[PDB]
Amino acid sequence: QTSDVVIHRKENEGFGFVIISSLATITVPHKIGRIIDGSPADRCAKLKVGDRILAVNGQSIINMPHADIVKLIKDAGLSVTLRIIPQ
């Protein structure tokens, strides 16, 4: 049940979601832990606060460290696409 969610932000704000990683074939270390109120992740509202992300901008991140995913989204631009799983 992998639903794909694009997140459009402005240049003044961020996407407004926090990724929590746990530190690997059947492992999903990264998920959503919180959502900043009044953020594009809150307005798009397609993210639940327990969604395990499989990929970021069409790039598998299950075997990717936390810092690399942060750097990936940090350069992603004003739109990012997460492949997620609800919870």
Add this chain to the structure above:
Amino acid sequence: FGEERESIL
């Protein structure tokens, strides 16, 4: 825990 990383984006 100590083996976890939270960072907002």
